[PDB]
């Protein structure tokens, strides 16, 4: 009963949306975000996760207040 | 909804200035004087037709009176 | 659920807003390749993971 | 191999004390002038059952000697105390059952309980149900007295250590034979998570040093040194003797 | 045999979720939220339930009449009539006994 039958009781969320990265990676019991490294001030980045670095970093967003500064 | 039990208070209640509306209902055997004041709806049940008229002489002329009978208004 | 937070319902409502197709007049622009919205999902077809 | 169950106990994750319905800390009131050069009177309001321990606890209510109001303590019931009783604590208290006196005032052969191992620590020795300690001698030169611990060992304490006269209630608790596994299950309702003990020889070599092969046995001596590292220390430690005694 | 439904969103038969089924017009049965059973006051000495004070929730005593939540007696409302009689004797007899024992007896 480790296969089809045991999946019926999965109705309790483990992760919900995070406030700093917007992904469903905020662990409710651990009170930390697995993706963006919440309340820890420094953003969570690792050298082994090089693809994780090119998905969310500088230049992947609107760059609202830095596009003018470098253009200036 | 409260109920008054005799004449000495309903005449006192009507002669006070807290009245808002009076509905008189003619049931099969009795008549109920549901005086609607600010807070409650006091009623008095009478089995004598003559005693009911004396109440109607005491109703102030600056208030609304509604007649209810075997047919709803 | 019947009970939800205020922020969660607004993000629920936006998912309803984005489940629409290309308007007909947009498809008639010159040099148009956008005919369908490939970001479309249905409640019984794909769960939006939120 | 894995970590033996003894190693997992020091972590304290599921082996924590189940102390939720416990009444509090059972100890003498803090030592002050009125408990050192006078007497305070306490009224035994009630006797209650503290989960996880075999002796009843008494709610004693002393009046505040310095301010206005009450001062509620939680003593351990000496056998014989009753509700509404008056108990006196101090260096000049009467030598009745339930009174608290320094260990240096009790005569030789006096039976005391809830003895302080150091003046002012509010109760260390002779606290289990039915247990007590006896006064052996006094030494007025250094103001120290000798008492016999319930294990039979002898200890030397300062004469200022307070103690409660009598024996602890709930005696004979362990004389009743447990009959059912259910009764043993309910014993640890307010204790640690240690009851159902699997024999080490019934496990596998990874889990325990006794995890045997084709026949359930130990294979090596079960008397070990005290200096054995955790994980391999099992059975008897620094055992000077074994077997049955004639 | 009219079968009813929970009116509120609670779906479990907890103590705070007590319901009573009453009748209404046309044979209709509705659901009434019934209150919990509360204990009364006890004498601070003997732990006996006092007489003359109702057994209602703590906030409901505020709505009660000021004379309907206590008994007109010394230590009334916190001690039984027996709890107080022994207090008077203790306060008097002990005072009299020591009035002749010390101070140039």
């Amino acid at each position: 009963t480790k296969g089809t039958s045991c999946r019926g009781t999965r109705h309790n969320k483990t992760h919900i949306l995070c406030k700093r990265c917007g992904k469903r990676s905020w662990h409710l019991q651990k009170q930390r975000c697995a993706s963006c490294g919440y309340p820890d001030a420094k953003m969570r980045q690792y050298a082994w996760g090089y693809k994780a670095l090119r998905r969310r970093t500088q230049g992947t967003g609107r760059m609202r207040h830095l596009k003018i500064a470098l253009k200036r | 909804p409260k109920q008054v039990q005799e004449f000495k208070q309903i005449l006192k209640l009507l002669k006070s200035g807290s009245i808002r509306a009076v509905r008189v209902k003619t049931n099969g055997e009795n008549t109920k004087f549901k005086v609607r004041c600010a807070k409650y709806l006091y009623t008095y049940i009478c089995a004598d037709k003559a005693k009911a008229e004396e109440l109607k002489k005491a109703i102030p002329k600056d208030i609304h009176v509604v007649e209810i009978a075997k047919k709803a208004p | 659920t019947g009970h939800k937070g205020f922020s969660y319902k607004l993000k629920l409502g936006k998912k309803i807003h984005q489940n629409r197709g290309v308007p007909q007049w947009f498809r008639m622009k010159t040099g148009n390749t956008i005919n369908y919205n490939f970001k479309r999902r249905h409640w019984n077809r794909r769960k939006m993971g939120m | 191999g894995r970590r033996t169950l003894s190693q997992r106990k020091g972590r304290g994750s599921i082996f924590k004390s189940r102390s939720h319905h416990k009444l509090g800390v059972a100890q003498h009131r803090a030592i002050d002038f009125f408990e050192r050069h006078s007497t305070v009177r306490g009224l035994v309001k009630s006797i209650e059952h503290d989960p996880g321990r075999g002796a009843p606890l008494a709610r004693v209510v002393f009046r505040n000697p310095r301010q206005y109001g009450l001062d509620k303590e939680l003593f351990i019931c000496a056998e014989g105390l009753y509700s509404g009783q008056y108990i006196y604590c101090g260096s000049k208290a009467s030598l009745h059952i339930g009174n608290v006196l320094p260990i240096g005032q009790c005569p030789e052969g006096t039976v005391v309980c809830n003895v302080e191992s150091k003046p002012g620590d509010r109760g260390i020795i002779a606290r289990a149900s039915g247990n007590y300690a006896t006064v052996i001698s006094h030494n007025a030169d250094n103001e120290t007295t000798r008492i016999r611990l319930p294990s039979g060992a002898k200890k030397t304490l300062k004469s200022n250590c307070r103690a409660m006269v009598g024996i602890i209630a709930g005696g004979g608790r362990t004389e009743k034979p447990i009959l059912k596994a259910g009764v043993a299950y309910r014993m640890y309702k307010a204790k640690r998570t240690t009851w159902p003990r699997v024999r080490g020889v019934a496990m596998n070599p990874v889990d325990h040093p006794h995890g045997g092969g084709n026949h359930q046995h130990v294979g090596h001596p079960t008397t070990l040194k005290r200096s054995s590292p955790p994980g391999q220390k099992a059975g008897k430690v620094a055992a000077r003797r074994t077997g049955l005694i004639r | 045999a009219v079968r009813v439904t929970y009116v509120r969103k609670h779906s479990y038969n907890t103590k705070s979720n007590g319901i009573r089924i009453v009748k209404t017009a046309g044979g209709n049965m509705t659901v009434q939220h019934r209150q919990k059973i509360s204990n009364g006051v006890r004498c601070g000495d003997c732990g006996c339930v006092l007489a003359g004070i109702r057994h209602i929730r703590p906030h409901q005593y505020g709505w009660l009449g000021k004379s309907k939540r206590t008994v007109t007696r010394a230590y009334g409302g916190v001690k039984c009539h027996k709890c107080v009689q022994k207090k008077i004797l203790r306060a008097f007899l002990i005072n009299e006994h020591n009035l002749i024992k010390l101070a140039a007896a």
């Binding site: - | - | - | 059952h49 000496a78 056998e79 009753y82 059952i97 709930g170 005696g171 009743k176 | -």
Partner: protein
């Protein structure tokens, strides 16, 4: 109704004759009334292990686990009194 298994007859036949005989002494003494040391009425009944309450007397007494007064708790009360009397006089 029984011959010799008086109160331990509820255990049936599944705990050993000796173990049922040993617990018979405790089970009889645990559920029995004792004379109240204040009102002298046979009303003291156990509430918890070591706590006894006099039903018609309004008193609670600390005692043994299954008996109101134990043997070790009786020689101690007499020993203290003898030392107390000797200490007071010379």
């Amino acid at each position: 109704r029984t011959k010799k298994v008086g109160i331990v007859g509820k255990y049936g036949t599944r705990y050993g004759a000796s173990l049922r005989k040993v617990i018979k002494k405790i089970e009889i003494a645990q559920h029995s009334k004792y004379v109240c040391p204040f009102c002298c009425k046979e009303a003291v009944r156990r509430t918890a292990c070591g706590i006894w309450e006099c039903k018609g007397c309004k008193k609670q007494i600390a005692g043994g686990a299954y008996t109101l007064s134990t043997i070790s708790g009786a020689t101690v009360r007499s020993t203290v009194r003898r030392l107390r009397d000797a200490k007071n006089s010379q």
